[PDB]
Amino acid sequence: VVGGTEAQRNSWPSQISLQYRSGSSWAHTCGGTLIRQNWVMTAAHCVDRELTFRVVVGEHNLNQNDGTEQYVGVQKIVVHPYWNTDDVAAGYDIALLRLAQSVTLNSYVQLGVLPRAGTILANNSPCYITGWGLTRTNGQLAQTLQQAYLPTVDYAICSSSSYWGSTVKNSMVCAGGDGVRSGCQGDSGGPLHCLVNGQYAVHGVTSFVSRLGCNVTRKPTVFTRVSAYISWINNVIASN
């Protein structure tokens, strides 16, 4: 997250860190949202590589013992069947991870609430992106979870020529684009949390930023629209 602030330890308990084994250590690569005690929702492009992955729930600082983490291996991966890694603009950037163990819930570990199917936020709806992604374009990952306030940009505006043009689809949510704050590499797969009727719900799964930079004016962060996949999610969990 570029232009973010440090999140309080218990603000976003459904946020997880998706990590891969690197030598004798684990490296954060993407965020995710805990949606069942043994299921995580993340971006399909985060699991394109055939690596060993683990999820960390109750994570706040990637580099220091928080006293609250639960480390759980990824046992099964279900990528959306229409995902194509060389066509992120087509959409379908979503995948579900079944965990090897069911995590224990508490104030640092909770399930993310998803929006009702088909829900589309009005332009400029207030939302927060959260993640440990780069804090600057071509920078480094954050040590502590960051949050940034990114209002939605509706399809009509987001798909206009000065914004994302034909690249954005109605199956995505755009947010931000002010040139100061945005998601960045390493935030992919994580949540876009938006307050609706007094409750936050996870409306987006971070998918991509501009090749020209993370925080680029009129290039809002683009997320997979969670509300377009409610039936898909329910169907995968019911058959797995």
Active site residues: 45, 93, 188
Say if CB 166 and CB 91 are below 8 A apart. no
Which residue number is nearest to Cl ion in terms of Cβ?
Answer: 14
Give whichever of 12 and 208 is closer to Cl ion, judged by the CB atom.
12
DSSP 8-state secondary structure symbol assigned to residue 113: P
Task: Count interface residues toward Na ion (CB under 5 A).
Answer: 2
Say if CB 2 and CB 214 are below 8 A apart. yes
The encoded tokens of residue 130 equal 């959260």
Least Å from the CB of residue 98 to Cl ion: 20
Give whichever of 23 and 67 is closer to Na ion, judged by the CB atom.
67
Q: Is 50 annotated as a binding residue?
A: no
Q: What are phi and psi of 234, to 5 degrees?
A: -60, -40
Least Å from the CB of residue 12 to Cl ion: 4
Least Å from the CB of residue 188 to Na ion: 20
Least Å from the CB of residue 65 to Na ion: 6
How many other C-beta atoms lie within 10 A of the C-beta of residue 5?
12
- Determine the Cα–Cα distance for residues 93 and 173; give it in Å rounded to an integer: 12
Q: Which does 61 bind (CB under 5 to 8 A by kind): Na ion, Cl ion, none?
A: Na ion
Task: Name the residue with tokens 């071509």.
Answer: 138
In residues, how long is the chain? Answer: 240
The three-class DSSP label of residue 126 is coil
- Work out whether 144 is an interface residue with Na ion (CB under 5 A): no
Q: Which does 12 bind (CB under 5 to 8 A by kind): Na ion, Cl ion, none?
A: Cl ion
Chain breaks in the chain (C to N over 2.5 A) after: none
Give whichever of 190 and 220 is closer to Na ion, judged by the CB atom.
190
Q: Which does 14 bind (CB under 5 to 8 A by kind): Cl ion, Na ion, none?
A: Cl ion
- Binding mask 42-81 toward Na ion (x if CB under 5 A, else -) reads -------------------x----x---------------
- Determine the Cα–Cα distance for residues 85 and 91; give it in Å rounded to an integer: 10
CA of residue 193 relative to chain centroid, distance = 9
Q: Is 240 annotated as a binding residue?
A: no
Residue 11 to residues 128, 140, 185, 229, Cα–Cα distance (Å): 11, 23, 22, 25
Least Å from the CB of residue 189 to Cl ion: 14
Q: Is 61 annotated as a binding residue?
A: yes
Give whichever of 33 and 182 is closer to Cl ion, judged by the CB atom.
33
CA of residue 195 relative to chain centroid, distance = 16
The encoded tokens of residue 11 equal 């603000």
Give whichever of 62 and 121 is closer to Na ion, judged by the CB atom.
62
Q: Is 170 annotated as a binding residue?
A: no
Please give the annotated binding residues for Ca(2+), written as ranges: 59, 61, 64, 69
Please give the annotated binding residues, written as ranges: 59, 61, 64, 69
Binding-site ranges for Na ion (CB under 5 A): 61, 66
